[PDB]
Amino acid sequence: KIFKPEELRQALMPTLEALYRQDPESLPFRQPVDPQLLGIPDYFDIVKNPMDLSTIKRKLDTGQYQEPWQYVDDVWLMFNNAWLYNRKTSRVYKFCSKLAEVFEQEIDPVMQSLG
């Protein structure tokens, strides 16, 4: 099980695409949280390892995932950051849960075909 970077990218991209295509639910995740702009200075005290869809795309595009599970970990990291920081009935949390639902449905067959 060694992965050619461009094949790993071609296999995983559709799952990322499916997250981006969710409108409105992807919109808070399409770019990084900037706590200084938002005036939420407690954010990096709770979210130690920020992640968002733009960063995941960059990493997927520049060979930073050697194995499929590192991509999965980063998608879950984005979700878990939102779920820990935000109120359960908040738009961000509700939106996050939708992306998670989409990801769960998308990722499973893909991971089985990879290994």
Author numbering: 1083 to 1197
Original authors' sentences:
Bromodomains (BRDs) are protein interaction modules that specifically recognize ε-N-lysine acetylation motifs, a key event in the reading process of epigenetic marks. The 61 BRDs in the human genome cluster into eight families based on structure/sequence similarity. Despite large sequence variations, all BRD modules share a conserved fold that comprises a left-handed bundle of four α helices (αZ, αA, αB, αC), linked by loop regions of variable length (ZA and BC loops), which line the Kac binding site and determine binding specificity. The four helices form a deep cavity that is extended by the two loop regions (ZA and BC loops), creating a largely hydrophobic Kac binding pocket.
Indeed, ITC experiments showed that the binding affinity of many BRDs was significantly increased for multiply modified peptides. For example, the KD of CREBBP decreased from 733 μM for H3K14ac to 131 μM for H3pS10K14acK18ac suggesting that many BRDs recognize a pattern of modifications rather than a single Kac mark. As a consequence, BRD acetyl-lysine binding sites are deep and largely hydrophobic binding pockets that represent attractive targeting sites for the development of Kac competitive inhibitors.
